[PDB]
Design an enzyme around this catalytic site. Structure first.
Site, PDB file in Angstrom:
ATOM      1  CE  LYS A 115       4.646   4.889   4.667  1.00 16.06           C
ATOM      2  NZ  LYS A 115       3.539   5.708   5.218  1.00 16.06           N
ATOM      3  CG  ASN A 138       8.652   5.519   1.486  1.00 14.36           C
ATOM      4  OD1 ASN A 138       8.840   6.100   0.424  1.00 14.36           O
ATOM      5  ND2 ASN A 138       7.722   5.892   2.356  1.00 14.36           N
ATOM      6  CG  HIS A 183      -0.647   8.918  -0.551  1.00 14.98           C
ATOM      7  ND1 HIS A 183       0.307   9.900  -0.662  1.00 14.98           N
ATOM      8  CD2 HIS A 183      -0.231   8.084   0.427  1.00 14.98           C
ATOM      9  CE1 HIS A 183       1.275   9.665   0.208  1.00 14.98           C
ATOM     10  NE2 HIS A 183       0.980   8.564   0.879  1.00 14.98           N
TER      11      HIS A 183
END
Ligand SMILES: O=C(O)CC[C@@H](NC(=O)c1cc(CNc2ccc(/C=C3\SC(=S)NC3=O)cc2)ccc1F)C(=O)O
Ligand SMILES: [Cl-]
Ligand SMILES: [Cl-]
Ligand SMILES: [Cl-]
EC number: 6.3.2.9
Length: 435
Positions: A115, A138, A183
């Site tokens: 990403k 981010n 995560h």
């Protein structure tokens, strides 16, 4: 949206939290700040006029709020936040605040791997077109720091956590690049819950760009696709050579790219699909693909000396990313692979298929060091720290070998962030890799 007169509580400081504080102050609203950390990053930069509560959440503040602005670093499932949600108090994050204000189209990119590369690449494609582009989210600057009336395009990397608190994104082009276990400490309903957070990015998107090779990137209910052997954007292998193609048409021979490797070629396809959907000229987009050199800490050669390549892939903070480093990897001699940190409850087993043969050694450290050494105990050593592991492996390194930091874990048990981990690796590589 008009925040005037509202009681606003920002949870989580750091640079992103500070950008939220600044956003509200500039609009004549004084927020209050809380953070579960005793001295969170940025505390010293917070203006004295702003009340703050640190070391825990303050339920008196939260339950009094008209608007709660939650850092991606605080779980929505935290009991104090769920109580506020149950009470009907509105909870948003920085990306939501940004979306409500932004006056240029937004390209939105998420995924378990790729990403930051794809975000940066689309940013470069825009720059090559002479577009005034704001790139961040981010990575780089927090989104609210990019907000500027003169911006003509925003390209935002969005995490699953930011997407959970976002409702008003209407991306000009949105992708989930891939979804691989990550995560899990934050997703107690497992892989599908994590996927679901990422699937939010497609809501009200003008174009959705999906990975033809990764079914989890597809909406649950069409989208443009990229992939290796299939997709609207895909690769065409031509005896030794690889081309990017769009719908059957060759657009770039990857020898013109500075990046190498299949997953970088698919990151290139995804960037091109997004750039095309955003209306960027295809010609300048291709040019950007040729000039882009990659990001620090992403399979970065920090030293090539005396027949040994020392590779900083500290940005590999999950199993999928390490798999991408190892899949198809060529090593002449021995691979000395550094694994370790906080694996976030991941299953490391998918790595074991890359770790056979006589030419692999593992050096495993940090919180989950022992679990990592367990992938293949007979070729593994465990240490407390990465420095110990480096000093252990260095005497064993022979010309032809590779030393690869691709740790499959977060760095946060022992480091500030994966950049610090990568920089420490590079410092030690330079010490240990020359006479
Ligand atoms: O750098 C590394 O090694 C690991 C990075 C790596 N980070 C994340 O999980 C992650 C971090 C961030 C950064 N933002 C914050 C903000 C606040 C905090 C901590 C808080 S906020 C609060 S209140 N109490 C806290 O402890 C942590 C991360 C955003 C999205 C993410 F997916 C990971 O993917 O494992
Ligand atoms: Cl608390
Ligand atoms: Cl082998
Ligand atoms: Cl030693």
């Amino acid at each position: 949206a008009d925040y005037q007169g509202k009681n606003v509580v920002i949870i989580g400081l750091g640079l992103t939290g500070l950008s939220c504080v600044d956003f509200f102050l500039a609009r004549g609203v004084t927020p209050r700040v809380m953070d579960t950390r005793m001295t969170p990053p940025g505390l010293d930069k917070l203006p004295e006029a702003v009340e703050r509560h640190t070391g825990s959440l303050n339920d008196e503040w939260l339950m009094a709020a008209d608007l709660i602005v939650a850092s991606p670093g605080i779980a929505l499932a935290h009991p104090s936040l769920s109580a506020a949600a149950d009470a009907g108090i509105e909870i948003v994050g920085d990306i939501e605040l940004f979306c409500r204000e932004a006056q240029a189209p937004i390209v939105a990119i998420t995924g378990s791997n790729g990403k930051s590369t794809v975000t940066t690449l689309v940013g470069e494609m825009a720059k090559a077109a002479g577009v005034n582009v704001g790139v961040g989210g981010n990575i780089g600057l927090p989104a609210l720091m990019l907000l500027d009336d003169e911006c003509e395009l925003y390209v935002l990397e969005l995490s699953s956590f930011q997407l959970e608190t976002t409702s008003s994104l209407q991306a000009v082009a949105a992708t989930i690049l891939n979804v691989t276990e990550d995560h899990m400490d934050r997703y107690p309903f497992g892989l599908q819950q994590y996927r679901a957070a990422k699937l939010r990015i497609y809501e009200n998107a003008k174009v959705c760009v999906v990975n033809a090779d990764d079914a989890l990137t597809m909406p649950i209910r069409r989208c443009v696709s990229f992939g290796v052997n299939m997709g609207d954007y895909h690769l065409n292998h031509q005896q030794g050579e690889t081309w990017l193609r769009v719908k059957g048409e060759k657009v770039l021979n990857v020898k013109e790219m500075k990046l190498s490797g299949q997953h970088n070629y698919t990151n290139a396809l995804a960037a091109l699909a997004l750039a095309d959907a955003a209306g960027l000229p295809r010609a300048s987009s291709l040019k950007a693909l040729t000039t882009f050199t990659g990001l620090p800490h992403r399979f970065e050669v920090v030293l090539e000396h005396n027949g040994v390549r020392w590779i900083n892939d500290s940005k590999a903070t999950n199993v999928g990313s390490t798999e991408a480093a190892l899949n198809g990897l060529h090593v002449d001699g021995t691979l000395h692979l550094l694994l370790g940190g906080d694996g976030k409850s991941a299953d490391f087993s998918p790595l074991a298929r890359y770790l056979n043969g006589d030419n692999v050694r593992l050096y495993c450290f940090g919180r989950d060091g022992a679990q990592l050494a367990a992938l293949r105990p007979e070729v593994a050593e465990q240490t407390e720290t990465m420095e110990q592991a480096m000093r252990l492996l260095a005497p064993r390194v022979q010309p032809g070998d590779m030393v690869l930091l691709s740790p499959a874990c977060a760095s946060l048990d022992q480091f500030k962030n994966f950049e610090q981990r990568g920089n420490e690796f590079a410092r030690l590589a330079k010490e240990l890799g020359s006479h």
